[PDB]
C-alpha cells in the first residue's frame, strides 16, 4: 500500500494551497499531515484527516473522502515554504506519502546560468571521468538536471548537491556530477545536462563532445 | 521539558550494527508508542516499526523483517532501535517520535535524529582536480571555475580561495557520499571572463581527519 502525492506545488503568498494525497484504503484510515523544513525534524499539522494539533494556526486545514486525503493551507505566507507528507495506516503498517515540495513565490523567477566541466586529464588518468554541471543562481529552488551520453538517458552514476539559500537575493545553486569509469567515458562523445526550471520556458541542454580543444 | 532525546551520530562498516537510543521523559514511555523512522538525503520518510515502552509491544514494517530490534530499559525510560546487517543505503537520520494510540493521533513529538553513515571506508584523504573554465562554463561575461574536491572520509572538509582574498561568487556545495563509501563535493566561483588571462585562481583545501592541505591551481583550458 503507497500513498500518492504531488512532487512539487507552486504558489504566490496569499493564494490557497492544495496538497492531494491518494490510496486505495484510506477511507478506510485516518490521514496525518506533517510539515518539515530544512535542517529540522517534522512536526504534525493535520491528524484523524481533519485535526489541528494544538498551536497549528488555522490555516491549514484537511479532508478525506474519496480515497483522496487533501491538506488546504489559507493565505499562504513566507513561512509555509516546506515539504509536506501524508501519512495513514493500513492494517497494522504506517505509509507516508512521497512528500509534496511547496514553494511559495516571494520574488520574480530566475532561471539558472548553466556550465558543464569536462573531467580533468589530472582525474582521467587515476581511472575515473567526473563530469559537472552547475546550476548557479535561480529561484525557485525546484530544478531538474538529467544526463545524456550519446543522447542515452543516465540513470544511478549522478549525484546532485544544493546551497543553502543566499541571505541577499534569496537563490540557489547546484551540481549534478556525473561518475564514469574512465573506459566508459572514453567509449562515447557528447556529454550533456539537461536541465529544466520554472524560469525556463523549455528546456536548456550545456553539452561538449569529449576532445574540444 | 525535552520529550525526546537520541544518542548521538554513528558510523559503521557494511554488514555491522548500529543501536540508536531514544530517551523519553517519564510521561511519553507512560502514555505513548514510540515510532522509529528514517529519512535519507533527499528523500522521504520510511517507517521502520514501533513498540509501546510501558507494555513492550513492538511492530515493524515488513522490509526491515529479522533486520531491526527494538528494545527498552524502563528503569531510565529509554527505547532502542538495533539495525542489523547494515548496507550502504542505510546511510540516513534515525528518528524516534512519539504517538497516542481508527485510533493513531499522530506522531506530535519528534527526536532531534541520529545520523547513522554506513561505509567501508578507512580515513583517507581527497584528490583535487581543477573544473577549469572554458567557453564551455562562460556565460557572457561571467566565467565559471572551481575545484572537485573527490573520494575523502569522514566529514567535514573545508575550501577557500586565494587563501580567503576570493569570497565574492563562490559557491561550496555540500558533500554527497558516494556508493563507494567516499564523499565528494564541489566549490566553484563565478569571476568576470575578462581576468581569466591575469588573475590567478587557487582553491584551499584541508580535510583534517586525513591532516590533507591541497592548493591547487586553477587554469583556463587551452
Ligand atoms: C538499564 O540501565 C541501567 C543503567 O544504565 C543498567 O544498570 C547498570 O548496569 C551496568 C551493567 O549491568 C552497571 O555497570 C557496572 O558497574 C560496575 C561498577 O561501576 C562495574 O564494575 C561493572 O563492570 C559494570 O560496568 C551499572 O552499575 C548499572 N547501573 C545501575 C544504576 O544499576 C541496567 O542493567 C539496564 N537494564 C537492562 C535490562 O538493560
Known amino acids: 500500500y503507497e500513498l500518492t502525492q504531488p512532487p512539487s506545488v507552486s504558489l504566490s503568498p496569499g493564494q490557497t494551497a492544495t496538497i492531494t494525497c491518494s490510496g486505495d484504503?484510506?477511507?478506510?484510515?485516518?490521514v496525518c499531515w506533517y510539515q518539515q523544513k530544512p535542517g529540522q525534524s517534522p512536526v504534525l499539522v493535520i491528524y484523524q484527516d481533519t485535526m489541528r494539533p494544538s498551536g497549528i494556526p488555522e490555516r491549514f486545514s484537511g479532508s478525506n473522502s474519496g480515497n483522496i486525503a487533501t491538506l488546504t493551507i489559507s493565505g499562504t505566507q513566507a513561512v509555509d515554504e516546506a515539504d509536506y507528507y501524508c501519512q495513514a495506516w493500513d492494517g497494522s503498517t504506517v505509509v507516508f506519502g512521497g512528500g509534496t515540495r511547496l514553494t511559495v513565490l516571494g520574488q520574480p523567477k530566475a532561471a539558472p546560468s548553466v556550465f558543464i566541466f569536462p573531467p580533468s586529464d589530472e582525474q582521467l588518468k587515476s581511472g575515473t571521468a567526473s563530469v559537472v554541471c552547475l546550476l548557479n543562481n535561480f529561484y525557485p529552488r525546484e530544478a531538474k538536471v538529467q544526463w545524456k551520453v550519446d543522447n542515452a538517458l543516465q540513470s544511478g552514476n549522478s549525484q546532485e548537491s544544493v546551497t543553502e539559500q543566499d541571505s541577499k537575493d534569496s537563490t540557489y545553486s547546484l551540481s549534478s556530477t556525473l561518475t564514469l569509469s574512465k573506459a566508459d567515458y572514453e567509449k562515447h562523445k557528447v556529454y550533456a545536462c539537461e536541465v529544466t526550471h520554472q524560469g525556463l520556458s523549455s528546456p536548456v541542454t550545456k553539452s561538449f563532445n569529449r576532445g574540444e580543444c | 521539558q525535552v520529550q525526546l532525546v537520541q544518542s548521538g551520530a554513528e558510523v559503521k562498516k557494511p554488514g555491522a550494527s548500529v543501536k540508536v537510543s531514544c530517551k523519553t521523559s517519564?510521561?511519553?514511555?507512560?502514555?505513548?508508542?514510540i515510532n522509529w523512522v528514517r529519512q535519507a538525503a533527499g528523500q522521504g520518510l520510511e517507517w521502520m516499526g514501533w513498540?509501546?515502552?510501558?507494555?513492550?509491544?513492538?511492530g515493524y514494517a515488513q522490509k526491515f523483517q529479522g533486520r531491526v530490534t527494538m528494545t527498552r530499559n524502563i528503569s531510565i525510560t529509554t527505547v532502542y532501535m538495533e539495525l542489523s546487517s547494515l548496507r550502504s543505503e542505510d546511510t540516513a537520520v534515525y528518528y524516534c517520535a512519539r504517538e497516542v494510540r481508527g485510533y493513531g493521533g499522530g506522531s506530535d513529538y519528534w527526536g532531534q535524529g541520529t545520523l547513522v553513515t554506513v561505509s567501508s571506508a578507512s580515513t583517507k584523504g581527497p584528490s583535487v582536480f581543477p573544473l577549469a573554465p572554458s567557453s564551455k562554463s562562460t556565460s557572457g561575461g561571467t566565467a565559471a571555475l572551481g575545484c572537485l574536491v573527490k573520494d575523502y572520509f569522514p566529514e567535514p572538509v573545508t575550501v577557500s580561495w586565494n587563501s580567503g582574498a576570493l569570497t565574492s561568487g563562490v559557491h561550496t556545495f555540500p558533500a554527497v557520499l558516494q556508493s563507494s563509501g567516499l564523499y565528494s563535493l564541489s566549490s566553484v566561483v563565478t569571476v568576470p571572463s575578462s581576468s581569466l588571462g591575469t588573475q590567478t585562481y587557487i582553491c584551499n583545501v584541508n580535510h583534517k581527519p586525513s591532516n590533507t592541505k591541497v592548493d591547487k591551481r586553477v587554469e583556463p583550458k587551452s
Open positions: 484504503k484510506l477511507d478506510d484510515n485516518y
Open positions: 517519564g510521561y511519553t514511555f507512560n502514555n505513548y508508542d
Open positions: 513498540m509501546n515502552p510501558y507494555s513492550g509491544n513492538t
